[PDB]
Design a binder for this molecule. Structure first.
Ligand SMILES: O=c1c2cccnc2n(-c2cccc([N+](=O)[O-])c2)c(=O)n1Cc1ccncc1
Ligand SMILES: [Mg+2]
Ligand SMILES: [Zn+2]
Length: 331
């Protein structure tokens, strides 16, 4: 016809909030026919002019994106395509913070967004330790070391080889080598076993924080640049408690569903039930307050310092949600 369907128009209107924290990502998932990752990535690529800059054919991008999304598991409650789309969109917002204006190149931006899109692809909904303890083929391949995170990368890159999926076909070898290194460095840093070290180095960076009069951040070497990009995507990955409570509670329900399912599998197998995975011995409210106090608030407070005052509202929202859960603990 040449004109959008009414569902497509309603989807387009929702996507006008692509640059805002708290996008209605679950509504977009529904309106797009469970294509949140494809539609959100396409919108962001168009907005940042990445198709023109990197000479990506539009049909190749849509084909690759649909293929990537298809390799997230629809049966997995949390680590699915909706989570991927959320992490992409959250990274997209963080990249555009005033404190980071003109800091990153288009290739570095491409790296952060692509890494976000692929960072949990083909997740089975169980932890690295579950895969290790069962002597899974994946664990054997990857020597029990960042098993899932290595796999997410291998799959994200492998899918480029499917029919009309090589979205990097026009990049030079130099551009591809740089992009690849950045993407690998970012996704391997999403392993939660790397969190404390990652946070340690972010703190040190804030301690030595340098800024150019009219104060955008100053980053002079790859180590500093990649460190900020790694922590940015890690912040996006751990951004659920910083969103409006209506969104945050949906994510909590999903991750508890996934965790309890793993616990049920551990129980039926005679394995010890992993932390937070026992549906018969859970303290959801207590656990969220602990999660925030020990992991999420320390990370985000440090990020907020790096980009001060850009992240004040995000940090305020986190603190409100923390107090809500705290007030909800049965004594
Ligand atoms: O993003 C969230 C997450 C997001 C929303 C709600 N809860 C989350 N929790 C969570 C769940 C139960 C208990 C605790 N705890 O610290 O005691 C944390 C989590 O660990 N992450 C990070 C994470 C996500 C996926 N796999 C492992 C860790
Ligand atoms: Mg992960
Ligand atoms: Zn993730």
């Amino acid at each position: 016809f040449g004109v959008k369907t009414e569902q497509e128009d309603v989807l387009a209107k929702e996507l006008e909030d692509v640059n805002k924290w708290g996008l209605h990502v679950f509504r977009i998932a529904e309106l797009s026919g469970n294509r949140p990752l494809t539609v959100i990535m396409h919108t962001i690529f168009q907005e940042r002019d990445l198709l023109k800059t990197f000479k990506i054919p539009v049909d190749t991008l849509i084909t690759y994106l649909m293929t990537l999304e298809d390799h997230y598991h629809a049966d997995v409650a949390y680590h699915n395509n909706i989570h991927a789309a959320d992490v992409v969109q959250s990274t997209h917002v963080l990249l555009s913070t005033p404190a980071l204006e003109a800091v990153f190149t288009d290739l570095e931006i491409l790296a952060a967004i692509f890494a976000s899109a692929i960072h949990d692809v083909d997740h089975p909904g169980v932890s690295n330790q579950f895969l290790i303890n069962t002597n899974s083929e994946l664990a054997l391949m990857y020597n029990d070391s960042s098993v899932l995170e290595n796999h997410h990368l291998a799959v994200g890159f492998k899918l480029l080889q499917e029919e009309n999926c090589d979205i990097f076909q026009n990049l030079t070898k130099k551009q591809r080598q740089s992009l690849r290194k950045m993407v690998i460095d970012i996704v391997l840093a999403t392993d939660m076993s790397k969190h404390m070290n990652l946070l340690a180095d972010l703190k040190t960076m804030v301690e030595t924080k340098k800024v150019t009069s009219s104060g955008v951040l100053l980053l002079d070497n790859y180590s500093d640049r990649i460190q900020v990009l790694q922590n940015m995507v890690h912040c996006a990955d751990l951004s659920n408690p910083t969103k409006p409570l209506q969104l945050y509670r949906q994510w909590t329900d999903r991750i508890m569903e996934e965790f309890f399912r793993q616990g049920d599998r551990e129980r039926e197998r005679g394995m010890e039930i992993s932390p937070m995975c026992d549906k018969h011995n859970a303290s959801v409210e207590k656990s969220q307050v602990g999660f925030i106090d020990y992991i999420v608030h320390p990370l985000w407070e440090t990020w907020a310092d790096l980009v001060h005052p850009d992240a004040q509202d995000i940090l305020d929202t986190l603190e409100d949600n923390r107090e809500w859960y705290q007030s909800t603990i049965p004594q």
